[PDB]
Design a protein around this ligand. Structure first.
Ligand SMILES: Cc1cc(CCCCCCCOc2ccc(C3=N[C@H](C)CO3)cc2)on1
Ligand SMILES: Cc1cc(CCCCCCCOc2ccc(C3=N[C@H](C)CO3)cc2)on1
Lengths: 255, 273, 236, 40, 273, 59, 40, 57, 59, 40
């Protein structure tokens, strides 16, 4: 009586149940694991807070309306302030982590709409100015708020044009990245497990984000007659196999 | 190898063509799941689509130019193209760039070919024979200042001398600092509020300097350098969506404003053929 | 001294030749490789992942909407969409498949075309997708369409339908850039019965459509893509 | 025959002949069998 | 091997020289069936009549020309021969063409040799040294527009750079779409009422582009390109009647009107020697 | 570096010589051969088929 | 010795030394013996 | 080859970090004598610092 | 005479290449080596000897 | 393969792979053990 459909994920002191899942994706078919010695470089023993950092943090909720263009969060940024995960983050020189991402959106059998939930490794954004204008730090570190693709261009911020993925590629091809759809008629959640993907064994958690999670409405939300025209979307994310190394004074970052 | 097996009528409870794309999978459906097929063999291996093959041919990565002329009274050799620099990078000419950016991280050895041809746009009695000297100036090593500085001694820095009209060829191991080169980097060099964003901060490998070894003749000679790059021993990770809009800058993803629609509009209906 | 003779071609530079060269950095030790998920070995590995087709090409500036094929409730017998199968051009051209095919001169193989339905769960519909092999015109009505490769799709719990365009061909390779002799057919879709919405519901519903290549597929003779060009070298 | 001492100086590599699209085409956590229902 | 065996007088009921040609056979009659012969050996193998040998020597297949000159103010490089195209084909120069069309389908690898020589028809101080760059532009790949377009980057398209006066040589595998190249094709590309008939519709392989890499000197330099083609690994099917009338077009069988009698008229009688 | 000497004829192009060359299309896979009746191997095979002689050349 | 990797790059092929004119000179359905009458 | 071995807390009478430089020696002290380390390998031979290489171009 | 083809790079001088050359002094016999204390093999050997740092740079 | 007769004409030497800093880092007459007191 197991269905692909019902699932339970327990991680730390927190549990999620979905009764309307559509399997789960594990990026590149690899599950998060700690850093092996053969791959290690820094000689420091690392710190593995385990259950105090590897639990589920639910970010603040978004509201899908007929005019929504899509939202974008960066990792580990989105979690920069969650509990002890965040403290560890500002206090060590280097850290490394994988995540379980669970995006939630329920409706009824009269609604229609379909969101794309995708994880993009190394999502370098484009400046809407063109040329070689850079995208300032603050703009690519929105924190739990994430970036709202239907917000206005700002100065020093990225471009927010959806048919171009914020980088000069077409929305249609985002499907080459680990992703899952939430089609109100099928699905009510999306779950993706992200292994740590980098060109170095461990890195800085503040100067470099290693994935952007993106939720994009593709088939517009259509509510039943005289229904309220909107649904909330909630994102809950859990660091998994986290390791921190090179402890010290506590980083100070712009803004 | 069979490309298609033989398959006949079906009346089952087992439907391989109905799936749920919401899952993120592309189910491996074949012609024989939905029509009646006959056996056929592949006769093919997919040899020429190997990434080593795809990135393994020489591509032009840079065209520069230097001239041989009397430096007498020149206050800025660099500025007179008495020599010149190439702030090495592969992202400057777009054909090869779109190919590499199909991947996120890439690792390979480089084979460089350098073709040098001379031009004599204004009245010369003859064509002189010039020797070019291309020198590798890595980060932290003294940049040349005149076309005949102590720098050109290049006692510790590789340098190749070849003749204009000829070609020079040598191969450099993968010089990246990390395990792969980042084709993309969503980071900064530090948490500064105004530091540059992107890959330019990362893909810092120094530069190349070219000069003519010959002193000047009576006429002036323009030498134009073309650098070709071939990846050998390629390794590529994490495929990405191909580049759709035009490029504007080395190392940023930025596209131009008021660009044009990249998807061709139908001449007719959705229903049109 | 061993006697030699040099042949025609000596001194040429062929960008496609593969030989040994002296290393400029004798004895240098590259950084160790660490493990990174996601390694690609063949472009054939990636063109099997499906991506969305902007089938609804009828707009005037690129929009998220050209990915949506609309469906109308209560129409009978009528046609949902049509397209030829020049995978290197037209709707296909910006898709990952289209985009890679363009790096090669010839292609052969089967294509997988699937449609995922997004209408309310309490609605229902039966569509017919038809592949018309080279030699006939794009079908003009379902009767015409239904006589070639087709699948009646019944919209249900299982949200997507995967149609395969089996390789139908005299010549074993076709050109990726659109050629006549080498042309591959048409793909059309019609109401089999009709879309029906539940009460309290209204308007258009949309289908999303994807394209990917079957394991069947072959691409050969690499060349340059018409999809990218430039007028001056970029700088930093 | 390599005439040179360093590995970078050798010619192009030889075909992976690796090929495994499943990391890209089927990264699902619970295995899907073709023919069995997608969602149970 | 015996070329003739010894044979003596015959008075038989078994007549090998009477046959019925209406049958379509050529009965294998020998000297020894009708005169008295002596033994003799062949001393020969028929080596130099092998089709590999017959089609295996280089033949000139194309002569084109490009010039190096100041492109300043040229609105159409292609038109100034600032570069040029060769809509590749083997049927353009007739010596090799008659040889190939002795067969209906032919399959082979090609070895190309390209000789480039320079001419300076009007007053120059000297002869410059130019490098040619021949590029393979296949069907569906961006044709160049100026002599120094992004196209010439040729990041995915083969290209060879050699010096004028020298020769370039490389070999291309059999690139046909079918199992053999059709020397003839009695068909159309589709059932259109006005589409072209013949082989031109079939033998579509794209084209070749040549250009000089050098910028301009003070004088102008004419470079004339000659492409030679040698078939290697030849396979030929279905022999046909040799070409009798002159050729008029690449790819059609058409002969010129009011052509001249191709059979030499006797100077004398049927009875004449 | 192995010492060599080049002989007279170096650099010449003889249309009849038979040597190896680099392939411009590394790794390309040609179309499979299918069977076709009629293969010719030697011109000596075909000159044994008889054909008509315009003997009456007097026109 | 081939110095190159691809087959197209090898020299000319070597003599068929096949040679069988009968597909061209005697494509008759019922075999004709020299010396026996052509038409029986 | 290990570049660093794994080493944990220490509370000893054996102090490798106190020396007398007046002796003229450079005592071979390592990270693992004064912090807690994890194993890591060298992955490197020191090829390009050989004097033959240094004076050989 | 063995057929050859020369590749791109022929005739170049790369200051970092390592090949054989004819000896200008054929048959000459170098002075014997005697023992000398102190041989260095790697620069890695010497950067492990400590030296003083002008830390007080303020002059 | 050496093509030449004299030893000077051969290419560069090959890595010492000798490496022993103690003549430079620990030339002390009485051996010092790390961890034992420097001056007893
Ligand atoms: C003489 C002489 C001259 C030289 C130069 C040696 C080459 C050094 C440069 C190494 C290559 O540097 C790279 C630049 C860019 C990239 C890269 N750009 C893309 C996004 C991806 O990778 C990789 C390597 O050596 N000897
Ligand atoms: C640089 C560079 C330049 C090139 C060109 C490669 C060659 C491609 C063309 C292949 C040969 O094309 C044919 C044209 C005609 C015929 C043919 N004509 C006759 C009727 C029969 O066959 C066969 C092949 O490759 N690299």
């Amino acid at each position: 009586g197991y269905s692909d459909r019902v699932q339970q994920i327990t991680l730390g002191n927190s549990t999620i149940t979905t009764q309307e899942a559509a399997n789960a994706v594990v990026c590149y078919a690899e599950w998060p694991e700690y850093l092996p010695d053969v791959d290690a470089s820094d000689v420091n023993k690392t710190s593995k807070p385990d259950t105090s950092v590897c639990r589920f943090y639910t970010l603040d909720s978004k509201t899908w309306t007929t005019g929504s263009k899509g939202w974008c969060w960066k990792l580990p940024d989105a979690l920069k302030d969650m509990g002890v995960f965040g403290q560890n983050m500002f206090f060590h020189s280097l850290g490394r982590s994988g995540y379980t991402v669970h995006v939630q959106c329920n409706a009824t059998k009269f609604h229609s709409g379909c969101l794309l939930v995708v994880v993009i490794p190394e999502h370098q954004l484009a400046s809407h100015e063109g040329g070689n204008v850079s995208v300032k730090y603050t703009f690519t570190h929105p924190g739990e708020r994430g970036i709202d693709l239907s917000s206005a261009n700002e100065v020093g911020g990225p471009v927010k044009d959806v048919l171009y993925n914020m980088n000069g590629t077409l929305l249609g091809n985002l499907l080459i990245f680990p992703h899952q759809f939430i089609n109100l008629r099928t699905n009510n959640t999306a779950t993706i497990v992200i292994p740590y993907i980098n060109s170095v064994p461990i890195d800085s958690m503040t100067r470099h984000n290693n994935v952007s999670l993106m939720v994009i409405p593709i088939a517009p939300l259509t509510v039943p007659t005289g229904a309220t025209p909107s649904l909330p979307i909630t994102v809950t994310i859990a660091p998994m196999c986290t390791e921190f190394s090179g402890i010290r004074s506590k980083s100070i970052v712009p803004q | 190898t069979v490309a298609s097996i033989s398959s006949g009528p079906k009346h089952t409870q087992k439907v391989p063509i109905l799936t749920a794309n919401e899952t993120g999978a592309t189910m491996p459906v074949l012609p024989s799941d939905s029509i009646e097929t006959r056996t056929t063999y592949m006769h093919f291996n997919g040899s020429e689509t190997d990434v080593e093959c795809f990135l393994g041919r020489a591509a032009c990565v840079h065209v520069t130019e230097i001239q041989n002329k009397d430096a007498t009274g020149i206050d800025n050799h660099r500025e007179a193209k008495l020599f010149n620099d190439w702030k090495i990078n592969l992202s400057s000419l777009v054909q090869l760039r779109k190919k590499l950016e199909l991947f996120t991280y890439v690792r390979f050895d480089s084979e460089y070919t350098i073709l040098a041809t001379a031009s004599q746009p204004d009245s010369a009695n003859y064509s002189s024979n010039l020797v070019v000297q291309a020198m590798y100036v890595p980060p932290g090593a003294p940049n040349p200042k005149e076309w005949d500085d102590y720098t050109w001694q290049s006692a510790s820095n590789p340098s190749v001398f070849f003749k204009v009209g000829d070609t020079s060829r040598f191969s450099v191991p993968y010089v990246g600092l990390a395990s792969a080169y980042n084709c993309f980097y969503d980071g900064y060099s530090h948490d500064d509020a105004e530091t540059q964003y992107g890959i330019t901060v990362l893909n810092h490998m120094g530069s190349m300097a070219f000069r003519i070894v010959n002193e000047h003749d009576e006429h002036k000679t323009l030498v134009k350098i073309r650098v070709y790059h071939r990846a050998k021993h390629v390794e590529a990770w994490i495929p990405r969506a191909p580049r759709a809009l035009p490029y504007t800058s080395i190392g940023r993803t930025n596209y131009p404003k008021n660009t044009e629609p990249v998807i061709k509009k139908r001449k007719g209906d959705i229903k049109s053929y | 001294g061993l006697p030699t003779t040099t042949l025609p071609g000596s001194g040429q530079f062929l960008t496609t030749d593969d030989r040994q060269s002296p290393s400029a950095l004798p004895n240098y030790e590259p950084t160790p490789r660490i493990h990174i998920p996601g390694k690609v070995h063949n472009l054939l590995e990636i063109i099997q992942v499906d991506t969305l087709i902007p089938m609804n090409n009828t707009h005037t500036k690129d929009e998220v909407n050209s990915y949506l094929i609309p469906l109308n409730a209560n129409r009978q017998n009528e046609q949902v969409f049509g397209t030829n199968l020049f995978i290197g051009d037209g709707v296909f051209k910006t898709t990952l498949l289209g985009e890679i095919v363009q790096y090669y001169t010839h292609w052969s193989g089967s294509l997988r075309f699937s449609l995922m339905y997004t209408g309310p769960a309490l609605s229902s519909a039966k569509l017919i997708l038809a592949y018309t092999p080279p030699g006939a015109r794009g079908p003009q009505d379902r009767r015409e369409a239904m006589l070639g490769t087709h699948v009646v799709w019944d919209i249900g719990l299982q949200s997507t339908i995967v149609m395969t365009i089996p390789w139908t061909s005299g010549v074993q390779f076709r050109y990726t850039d659109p050629d006549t002799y080498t042309s591959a057919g048409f793909l059309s879709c019609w109401y089999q019965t009709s879309l029906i919405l539940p009460p309290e519901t209204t308007g258009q519903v949309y289908l999303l459509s994807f394209i990917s290549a079957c394991p069947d597929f072959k691409l050969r003779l690499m060349k340059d893509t018409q999809t990218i060009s430039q007028t001056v070298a970029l700088t930093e | 025959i390599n005439y040179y001492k360093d590995a970078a100086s050798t010619s192009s590599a030889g075909q992976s002949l690796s090929m495994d699209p499943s990391k890209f085409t089927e990264p699902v956590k619970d295995l899907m069998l073709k023919g069995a229902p997608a969602l149970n």
